[PDB]
Structure formats: C-alpha cells, structure tokens
Amino acid sequence: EIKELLKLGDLPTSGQIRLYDGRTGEQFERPVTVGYMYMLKLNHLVDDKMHARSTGSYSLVTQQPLGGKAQFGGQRFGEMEVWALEAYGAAYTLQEMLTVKSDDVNGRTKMYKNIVDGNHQMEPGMPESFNVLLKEIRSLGINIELED
Amino acid sequence: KPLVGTGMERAVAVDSGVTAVAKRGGVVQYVDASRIVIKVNEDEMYPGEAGIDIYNLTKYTRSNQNTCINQMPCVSLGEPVERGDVLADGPSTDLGELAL
Amino acid sequence: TANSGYLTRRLVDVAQDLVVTEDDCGTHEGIMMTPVIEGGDVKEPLRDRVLGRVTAEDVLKPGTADILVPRNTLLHEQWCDLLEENSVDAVKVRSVVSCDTDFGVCAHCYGRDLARGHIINKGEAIGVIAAQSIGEPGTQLTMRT
Amino acid sequence: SVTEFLKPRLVDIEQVSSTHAKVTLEPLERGFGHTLGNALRRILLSSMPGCAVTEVEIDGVLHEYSTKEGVQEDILEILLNLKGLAVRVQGKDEVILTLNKSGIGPVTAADITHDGDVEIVKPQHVICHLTDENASISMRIKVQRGRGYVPASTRERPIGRLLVDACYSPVERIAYNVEAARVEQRTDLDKLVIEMETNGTIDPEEAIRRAATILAEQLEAFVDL
Amino acid sequence: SVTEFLKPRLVDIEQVSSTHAKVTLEPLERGFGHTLGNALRRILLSSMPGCAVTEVEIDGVLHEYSTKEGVQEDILEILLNLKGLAVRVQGKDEVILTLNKSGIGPVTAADITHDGDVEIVKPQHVICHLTDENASISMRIKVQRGRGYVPASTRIPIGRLLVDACYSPVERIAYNVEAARVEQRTDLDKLVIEMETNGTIDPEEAIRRAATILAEQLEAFVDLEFDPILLRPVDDLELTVRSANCLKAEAIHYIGDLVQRTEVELLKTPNLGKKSLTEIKDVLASRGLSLGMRLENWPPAS
Amino acid sequence: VDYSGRSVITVGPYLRLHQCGLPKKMALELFKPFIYGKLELRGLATTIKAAKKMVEREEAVVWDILDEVIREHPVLLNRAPTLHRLGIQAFEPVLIEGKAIQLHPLVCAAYNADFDGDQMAVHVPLTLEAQLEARALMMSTNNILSPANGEPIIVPSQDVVLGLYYMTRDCVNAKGEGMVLTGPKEAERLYRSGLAS
Amino acid sequence: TEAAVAGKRDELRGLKENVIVGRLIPAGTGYAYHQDRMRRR
Amino acid sequence: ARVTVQDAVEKIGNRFDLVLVAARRARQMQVGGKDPLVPEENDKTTVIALREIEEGLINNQILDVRERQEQQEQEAAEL
Amino acid sequence: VYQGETTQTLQDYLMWQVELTPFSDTDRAIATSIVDAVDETGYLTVPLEDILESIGDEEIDIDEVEAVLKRIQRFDPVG
Numbered sequence A: 001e002i003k004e005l006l007k008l009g010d011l012p013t014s015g016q017i018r019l020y021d022g023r024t025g026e027q028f029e030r031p032v033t034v035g036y037m038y039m040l041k042l043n044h045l046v047d048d049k050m051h052a053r054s055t056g057s058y059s060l061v062t063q064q065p066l067g068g069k070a071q072f073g074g075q076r077f078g079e080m081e082v083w084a085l086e087a088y089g090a091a092y093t094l095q096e097m098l099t100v101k102s103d104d105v106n107g108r109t110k111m112y113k114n115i116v117d118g119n120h121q122m123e124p125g126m127p128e129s130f131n132v133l134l135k136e137i138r139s140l141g142i143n144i145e146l147e148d
Numbered sequence B: 001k002p003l004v005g006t007g008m009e010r011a012v013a014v015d016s017g018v019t020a021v022a023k024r025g026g027v028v029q030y031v032d033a034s035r036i037v038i039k040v041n042e043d044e045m046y047p048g049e050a051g052i053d054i055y056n057l058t059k060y061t062r063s064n065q066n067t068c069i070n071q072m073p074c075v076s077l078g079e080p081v082e083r084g085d086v087l088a089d090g091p092s093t094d095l096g097e098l099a100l
Numbered sequence C: 001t002a003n004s005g006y007l008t009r010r011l012v013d014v015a016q017d018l019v020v021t022e023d024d025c026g027t028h029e030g031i032m033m034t035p036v037i038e039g040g041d042v043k044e045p046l047r048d049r050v051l052g053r054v055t056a057e058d059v060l061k062p063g064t065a066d067i068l069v070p071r072n073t074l075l076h077e078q079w080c081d082l083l084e085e086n087s088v089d090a091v092k093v094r095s096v097v098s099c100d101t102d103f104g105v106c107a108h109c110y111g112r113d114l115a116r117g118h119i120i121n122k123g124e125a126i127g128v129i130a131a132q133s134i135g136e137p138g139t140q141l142t143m144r145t
Numbered sequence D: 001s002v003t004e005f006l007k008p009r010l011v012d013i014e015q016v017s018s019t020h021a022k023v024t025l026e027p028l029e030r031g032f033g034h035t036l037g038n039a040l041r042r043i044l045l046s047s048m049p050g051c052a053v054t055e056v057e058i059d060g061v062l063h064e065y066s067t068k069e070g071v072q073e074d075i076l077e078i079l080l081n082l083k084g085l086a087v088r089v090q091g092k093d094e095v096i097l098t099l100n101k102s103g104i105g106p107v108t109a110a111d112i113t114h115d116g117d118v119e120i121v122k123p124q125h126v127i128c129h130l131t132d133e134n135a136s137i138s139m140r141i142k143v144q145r146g147r148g149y150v151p152a153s154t155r156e157r158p159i160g161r162l163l164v165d166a167c168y169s170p171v172e173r174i175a176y177n178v179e180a181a182r183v184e185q186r187t188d189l190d191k192l193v194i195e196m197e198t199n200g201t202i203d204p205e206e207a208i209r210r211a212a213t214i215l216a217e218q219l220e221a222f223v224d225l
Numbered sequence E: 001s002v003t004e005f006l007k008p009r010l011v012d013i014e015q016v017s018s019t020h021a022k023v024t025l026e027p028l029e030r031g032f033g034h035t036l037g038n039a040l041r042r043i044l045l046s047s048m049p050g051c052a053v054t055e056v057e058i059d060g061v062l063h064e065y066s067t068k069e070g071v072q073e074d075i076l077e078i079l080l081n082l083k084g085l086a087v088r089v090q091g092k093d094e095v096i097l098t099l100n101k102s103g104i105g106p107v108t109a110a111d112i113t114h115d116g117d118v119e120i121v122k123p124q125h126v127i128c129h130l131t132d133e134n135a136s137i138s139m140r141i142k143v144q145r146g147r148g149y150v151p152a153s154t155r156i157p158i159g160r161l162l163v164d165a166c167y168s169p170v171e172r173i174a175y176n177v178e179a180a181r182v183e184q185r186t187d188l189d190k191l192v193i194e195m196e197t198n199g200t201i202d203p204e205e206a207i208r209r210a211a212t213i214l215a216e217q218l219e220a221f222v223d224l225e226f227d228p229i230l231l232r233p234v235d236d237l238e239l240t241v242r243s244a245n246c247l248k249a250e251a252i253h254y255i256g257d258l259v260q261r262t263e264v265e266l267l268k269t270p271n272l273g274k275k276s277l278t279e280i281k282d283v284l285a286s287r288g289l290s291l292g293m294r295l296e297n298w299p300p301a302s
Numbered sequence F: 001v002d003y004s005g006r007s008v009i010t011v012g013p014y015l016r017l018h019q020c021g022l023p024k025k026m027a028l029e030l031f032k033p034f035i036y037g038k039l040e041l042r043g044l045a046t047t048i049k050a051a052k053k054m055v056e057r058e059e060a061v062v063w064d065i066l067d068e069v070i071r072e073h074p075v076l077l078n079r080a081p082t083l084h085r086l087g088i089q090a091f092e093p094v095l096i097e098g099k100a101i102q103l104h105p106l107v108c109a110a111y112n113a114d115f116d117g118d119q120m121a122v123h124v125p126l127t128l129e130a131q132l133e134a135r136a137l138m139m140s141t142n143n144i145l146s147p148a149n150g151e152p153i154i155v156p157s158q159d160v161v162l163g164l165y166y167m168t169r170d171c172v173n174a175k176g177e178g179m180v181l182t183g184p185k186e187a188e189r190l191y192r193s194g195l196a197s
Numbered sequence G: 001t002e003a004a005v006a007g008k009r010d011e012l013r014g015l016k017e018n019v020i021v022g023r024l025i026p027a028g029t030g031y032a033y034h035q036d037r038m039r040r041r
Numbered sequence H: 001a002r003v004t005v006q007d008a009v010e011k012i013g014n015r016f017d018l019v020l021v022a023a024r025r026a027r028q029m030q031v032g033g034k035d036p037l038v039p040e041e042n043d044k045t046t047v048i049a050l051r052e053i054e055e056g057l058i059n060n061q062i063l064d065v066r067e068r069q070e071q072q073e074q075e076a077a078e079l
Numbered sequence I: 001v002y003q004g005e006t007t008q009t010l011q012d013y014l015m016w017q018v019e020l021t022p023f024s025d026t027d028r029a030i031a032t033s034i035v036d037a038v039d040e041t042g043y044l045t046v047p048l049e050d051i052l053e054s055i056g057d058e059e060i061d062i063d064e065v066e067a068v069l070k071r072i073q074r075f076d077p078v079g
C-alpha cells in the first residue's frame, strides 16, 4: 500500500533518491533514504544544564561549597573520583581538590591571592570538616586528639 | 499535525480538557482571539433564557513546568457549530488533533 | 547497578593500602602456572597466563637439564615464544601472594604495569587499580538466576 | 589552441512565474559547467541582499504576548505574518510604512499606504483579520536592507516597539543542470541552465551578475598571492 | 555595507620543497572556503594546460605484453617510467624524441637527444636498466600538448604503445577549512591548500594560473595599551622639592616607573628619607596607586 | 569543590586526540582569577576592582586575555559514574561558541558515553604540580592501553570502520579497472576526477 | 567503641587516612614526600 | 606546544620523578628570575621545563649542583 | 539538616580588597586595624590615634596610617 501511494505521487517505489553534496556538488555514490519524520523537542534544554563556578558561598558548618545551580554551587568530587585520582598517582591534584578548593579557609584565600599574583603554589592546611568531626566525637564523651 | 498517525489523536485532544468544546450547537455570533460567543439554536434553548454560550480563552498562562498554555480559535465568524465540536485549540493541538 | 557498586566499594576498601614499596624481596616461593583445560577444551593457553611475569625458578628443557630461562626474568613476548618453541606446559612464577615484603609488595613479584610496557614502578597504588579492574565489568554480569 | 578557452554568455532568460526563472549560460568547456554551477548556487544561497521588516509598532499593544480586541490573531501571529512580507525598496536603505484599516474583513498588504520608493510585490499577502465592525488597526512597519539572517536577540527602546528576526535573503531555492550544447562545429561544449526560485524582489540577471562579481572579487586575492 | 565582504589578510606560504607548498588564507566569509577550494581544485585537476608523453614505439617490441632481451624491467615498467617524465616544450605542440643507448647501466632522461625546444626538468629520471654488455635500447617518444588527464583506454599502426597522458603539472592538491575569529565575528573560514607539482612550474604559479583562468571565465558577467594614568609625567603629582629632586636623580619621569619601584629599593636611595617615601606613598594612594605593581613590558615605545 | 562546572556533551569531529571543546562562557567563569592577574599584569587595570568591572562588562580585550591564559593549561573532564581511572582525563581546551562541551569520538569508549543527553563535569588544576600531573599522567595521549588487561582503548568504531571498510573493497567490473598507476597520488587524482572507481 | 576501650593509636599509614586529613597520599608523586618524612623521623 | 611527554619520561626514567623535577624547574623560571635554557616559543613554564628536560639540559643532579653553586657564590659575595 | 550560608558583609569585601592590594606587612596590619573600625554605614568610628595605639609598634608615625587610610578610602565603594 505504501508503494502504491508512492506511485500515486510520482515518487520512486524504493523510497530512495539521489543526493548531492552541498559543499562540492558531486553526487553521493549510493541512493539515500529521504522522507519525512515527526520530531519532538524534549524538555532537556542546555540553557538549564550549563553551569560554572570559580568561587562563591559556603556552608556555615562544613565550610564547603554549596550544591545546585540555583545557588552558585560547585561539582561534587566523590569517592570514585578520589579512587580514580589515586590510581593515576596524582597526589598534588587530589590534595588541592581536598584542601584549597573546598574547606580550608586560609588556604582558599592564600591560593586566590597567589593566583592573582601569578604564583601557582599552595599551602595545603587542614580541612575544617575534620575539626567538626573531632568536636562531634568529643561531644560523645570520647577523648580523641592529635599528638606530636 | 503528525501527518503520519494512528487515529487516536482526536480522542486524546478532546478527552483532555485543553481545548474548548461547544456545549450546545448553534452559530458563531462573535469570534476573537480571547473570547467566542455562540448563538444557541432555538431547539436547544431553555425557556425564559437568552441563548448564548460565552467561552473565554486561556492566554499565555504558566503551567506547572514553567511552559506556556495558550488557546487559539479555530472557527470563523458565522459558521455553524454542533455539540461536541472543537472551538479553540490548546497547546500541542491542531484542529482538534494532538500535535506534539 | 547497586550490587556492582557495593561490590566495587568493598573491593576498594579491602585493598586501598597496598602500594609497591620495594624493588625485590629475594623470595624463592611462587605459583605453578599451567594452561586451563576443562574436559576436552582448553579455555586459556599458557602464553596469556605467564606474559609479563617474573620466573621464580630456572626453566629447564623438558628432555635435558639445561637452563632455558634464568631465574628473575621478565617474560616478555620473546620469552613466551621461546617457551612455546620447546613445548613447556608449567612455569613457576612469582606472585604478590608469596611475597616477603612487609607493608606492601615488590616490583618483581608484581611484574608488568599492563598500562605501560615496562615493569611496575615503586609508589604505585596497585590495590585500587585491581579493585577498579575487577569491579568495572560488574555491570556486564547477570544478577538474576 | 589548447590554452584558449571559450567563455560563457547569458543567452536565454525565461520567466516561468513572477518568482520562478531560468537563466542560460553558453558555451562552457569540459568540467566548467559544474565548477561554475556549484559556486554560483552557494553564492546565490548565501550572499544575496534584500529588504526585510525589522520593527513593528501597534497603537494598543505593549508586547508580543497579548491580544487586540476585534482581531482574530494574536500579536505574535501578526508578527510572524509580517516576517514573510516581500517589499522592494528602490531609493533608500530604510523606510517606514503605515497601515490603517477598519471594518470587518481581511487586512492584507494592499492596505499599506502607498510610497513612491516602496513596491509591494504580493498585494494579496494576508496580514490579519478584523472580526468586529467597530474595530480598527493602525501600525508602523520598519523595513531595511541587509543580507543573511539576523535574529533580534543578537541585535533603550520604548515599550510597544516589537522586534522581528530579519531574513534578508530573497532567494528561496537554486538548482542547476548541465546539458550538451550545439555549437557551430564542435561537440565538446556544454550549456548551464540555472533554475532560480525567489520571492519576486530581485531580478535574476542582476542576481547572477552580483554573484559573479562576488566570486571575482573573492578570487582576485589568489591571482597575486 | 551590504556589498562588501572580508578579504584575506594573512597569506602564509610554507615551502616544504621545490615542488611542494602549503598556503594559508584567513579570514574568509562563512562557506567561501569550501567554494574557493573546490573551484581551484577542480580547475587544477581537470583543466590545466601542459605537455606530456602520448605514445611510444620500440624497434624490438611489437606488443604491450612482450619481453625485451637485455632489459631488467618489463615493457609496462618502461611505460610507467615514461609517464612520469615531465618535459617543457615551447616551440611546437607536438615533438618527437629518440632514445638510442648501448652498454651497461641506468638509461635515464639524460640520455635523450638534446633539442632546442624540448627541455627535460629531471635528466636523472631513470627510464630503464641495461644489464647485458651486448644489449641496446632504441625507441621513439611522442610528446604533445593538452589539458588534464587522458587515459589510454579511451583511445583504444603496429608497435604503437599508448601511454596515459598527464598534461596537468599538478601531481597532488588538497584543501582544508578551519575556524577563524575576528574580534567580533566568529563563524569565519580559514583555508589551507597543500599542493605538489611535477617540477615544470611552481605551486604558487599553478595557483595563480588557475585563479586567472577562473577569473577570466567570468568576464562576461562581472560588473565594475596601558592605563592613561600610568603615562602621566611624575610632575603631575604635587610632590615636594626634595622628593621631586630625588625622583629626578633616580631617572624617574613617568608614573609607571615610580609605580614599579618597591619600597625597599627607594629606602636605600640616597637623600630619600622615610618621610619623603611616606609622602610619595600618600600622593600615590590619593590616586588609588601603590608601589608593588608589576608590568610585563612597561615602555610602550614612547 | 570550586573551579568546577558541568554541561551536556556533543561530538567534535575536527578535534585532535589531546584537545577538547570548551564553551567560552564557562571558561570566563572558571579562569576568573587568572584573568584578573593577567589584566593587572599588563596595565589594563590598575586595581582589582577595575579588573572586576572589566570582566563584568565583558570587554573585547578580556577575550584575548582568556585566549592567552588558556593557551597551555589542561582541564579535567569526568563523567559519572567513574568506574575506573579512565573516567577522568586531561585535555587542552579550545574555546568554542555555544553551551555544550565537544568531545573527541575516539575517547568515547573509555568514558562509556554517547551523545543522547550525557553530561560531563570539568575541573581546573591550579598549581604547577597539578598541571604537570595532568599533562604527564592524566593526559588522553598517555592513556592508550587498558590497565586491566593491556588491550587498546582507542579502537575506532561505527562510522570510521564503515568508511574504511567501504573504501578498501574491490568490485569485479568497476570503472578504471585494469590500468597501471605510478603511485597513490595518481590513484587519488584519478578518483577525484571521476575517471576511476 | 572498641578503639576507645582499647585506647588505640593511628599512625596514618594508608591512603584513606591521609585523604581524611588532607595530606599527600603515600603513592604516586607523594611517595618521595613520605619517604623523606620517614627518613627525617 | 606539547602532545606527548614520552621522551622526557625516557630521559628521567620515572613518570613520578619527572613531575617533581619539572615543577621545580617551572617554579624556578616562574617565581624566580631564571631564564630558559631553550628558545621559548610562546610557551608556559611547564612546557619550557619539559622541553629543557627532553634536551637533557635539566635533571635533578644539575639542579642540585646549580643550587649549591649559587649558594656558595652568594655566601662568598656577602662579605 | 540545616547549616546555612556564608554572607559577605562590608568588612568582608574590604578585607578581600585589602588582601589583593600590594601592601607590606606593617601596612597590611594597619589596613586590618582600619577595616576593623568601620561601621555598617562605612564611616570610621575611631580616631587615628586609637589605630596607632592598637598597632602596638613604636616605629610607626601618624603619616603611614594616613597614607594607608587614603589608599583604603579609594576601595569599592568609593568614600
């Protein structure tokens, strides 16, 4: 029936015609299936997907960057990414991910100042979440401390 | 319209309350981009009543997904209409058929 | 997917601290490697099981007492070709399980990097690499009976 | 001689319609037919200039997402209809047309106020419809010349001035064919037939000449090198 | 404004060899790179005047599939060697050459009989190898003038061995289109053409002649710094006499020079005490400037 | 972490193996302190607030500054879930127009990614050690063998395989059959001229 | 609970322990740093 | 530019030590006043250091010897 | 669980601008003292003699404090 309808419209039965390249004008070596299809635009727009951040706001407790695009949030570097970095042997990249980018308050300021001055060096420091963990464990009646 | 369908587009378009459907038959007395006034036939009019149906169309309103809901008339001035006919097309609707 | 993730997380946790911290431990122990034969079919030849490994003993010719491959030799492609020339069906090699190194393993008991062409360097976290290598194809397996 | 090439000339121009034409170039050497045809098609489809509507003002409207009482179409649909208006401006690079209409019926391009330097090539182009007897519409339409596609986003204005994306290209489609030409005493010459479909706002011969001039001016850089 | 188009500004030429060249042109209007490249490639491949060998006659050979005694190569090998021979002809459009050679060694293009009109671009071009001492080669070669490539199959006496005719000097040509950006416009083309010739003419000359041919084909239709405050003199600041004298002695004339001077260096300057340095810092602070600013290349050739 | 972003990925067929396609709107935000430092370095801005306002206004010179500062500075591309260490790789950015990240096809197998809605995250190394680790350890050109088994990970697939298979095939009676050629260049010249199949 | 009862002490020798406290892991490019620390200790 | 670092790895012998040596040289060229030992072509300090290492002009022993010589010269010229 | 967000006040902005300004150690301490004594409306709430006393060093005159204050007064917002 489709072939009969194509014949009624003076069109090839096979549904394939000859096409030419728009940049060179030469014919493609094989017939190409050309027709009409119903296409839909889905509710996944890149305008709602693209997001980037250099610096912004942080949590009051963990002092880490917030999440989401509604706020000027950062991307989460989870355990699997840490494993991937460990498998490469890139210790400095992991260390700068852990301290000067997320939750080292003095390290963030020092790194920003050094970057603005053209000195690409960092002072790692101690994450704040470790201090929060120490305080929370001490609140349970357990004496945990750093020594030496 | 899909131009290649299955025959279920009209049922989806009508059963969904996105379109304006004539409650009673008559003649299009007034047509506008925002309102439609239908003069009801005298054989469908209730006693002691001026027989007119007024349809106020939804124009550029926000949906739950922050999209646009807008209704467009699909009838002309003075043409006859019957009960169940489509008077306005809602979003993703073309002459009473689903058009995604 | 969740089962694969749990398995790979446990595998990473159990071996996260294993690092190549030595060049040679001097051990003589090892494991015997033979081709994998099931019934009347060979699913794994000897070449793919000893390639890139270090011999734990002198490999002798089957009919004589002549050393064909000396001890502490990294079996590259040419050594495998030499072994298959003389029809060798069992080679004793060094493995990380039989390693005398304390708090880590040595390069000789591990062997080839498998990402480069040379022997493994010191300071490589081979436990995490192993856990990721085992866990990555976990989504290609079947979970339902 | 083998270093001397016979050069083509414009032989026949056929006006099948007001927006459909055929142009004949003859004679051509072996291989020059496609070589000229592809370049001419690309230049005609890419670099032709024309006039387009860019700005609209309606008395009673504030933005494109509203409706006017007595008009069956939304303002956005009216703007979309105006995007397709074909106008030939012969004296300036910018003009403002005025439209005034009242009474029940279709409002088309023939209702635009006459101007000496402005020609409307399709008077039957429907713009909108008035459904109320006591309904009138008055608008000012800004038309200017350019080339290519310029969305309004890429290019303060008072409230009520509506921007419309400009498509200045007058050419709708181009096709070309190479046939065997019948010259006096040779059988190794070709003839190039160019079928051109436009909106009726440009002469085919001047379009061909403009494309040839563009090609020559772009190619003159390779002559010196 | 509607009839003006971009023109190439940076035409870079890389000469890989005497016959191989690479040309780069940018910027171009969107889509024009493909147009120009395709047109030039088609012209340089199909329609390019030149001179080439057409057919040969060997005394001892009567058929294409034969066996010549004493010659290391086959007859079709000799035909392939002849197809690669590039010859310049100025006098006529059809010349005949003779090759007669006896002995042992490589018979090459240097052994052809000399003629005023005929010029051989590569006399070292190997034609064949003569092995036996009592062996000789005798052949007659016809060279004609034409355009492009003509296979010998389309042309299908006795002993006339046909050879594919390659009149076009171009041996290879390819083009590529890449992205280039002006400060505002971004969707613009950059054209790179790599071409190798046979040695008769230069690649630049071949490109020029192809462009000239295409242009003549259309004759019937073509119608005719730093911030300004840094450049102000140090006399702009209302410094005291002593401070001004110290700065003049320190060979400081502009604000940038003083700005690039650190406090430690200025402290060691004779006749410049801490009070004068504090005054200088104060007058710099009144304009939002400090003493610890660095500049890559401060003097702007002025 | 800071200095990070994400967006949808498209295919860049023109890219080299060590290159990626980065939108310039993302790059302007990612490299903001570097842009501030470079603006202050060459006298365009005399204070930090001047550079801040210049970047906010998006002047013409800040794009040249960005192009200069992103010249040789690797960025890390990661796709979740990161099943192995090949899920994070280092690339040299190329500034592009739009909002999608262009990805080299040959590295799509290591990421297990396809162009039907996938999104990737981008991270910027800060220190010299991090940049040199990205260039010498996490660069794509360094990852050509699988650490699990030693097999290559840059296997061509689909369109490239189809094209190479089509071009390297013979037909019994094709145009131009039975002639002798001086070399590959003559074969290409014959093919482009329509004289041989 | 078991560690608190036993009064255990952690030497921070593994990768995860150094990741917790934001130090260089004793592997890859951080191996020389830990070797130098051990030699100086 | 740079696409591969295989030659530098072969010269140094280890990928992990190459990063440290190149970082040391790049920090000398960036923060310090040292000039490159190779003709720089619009390259950054990391790429310049890698090119210097590839040519054999820079290694750990050379850097240590240069540091010792500079310290001795400074201590001698201090008086 | 709720944690909240860190908000940037006038003093945070002033200290951020101070840290990115080529000050010396003494000048940075003076700038910290000056920024400390700034109220919500942007006015200095103490005389410069109090700032000089708060510095705690006997080698600094009122002129250096004046210069640092004039440099700070040109930050954003101006005044």
Ligand SMILES: [Mg+2]
Pocket (backbone or CB within 6 Å): F113, F114, F115, F116, F117, F118
């Ligand atoms: Mg997908």
Ligand SMILES: [Zn+2]
Pocket (backbone or CB within 6 Å): C024, C025, C026, C027, C098, C099, C100, C101, C105, C106, C107, C108, C109
């Ligand atoms: Zn061992």
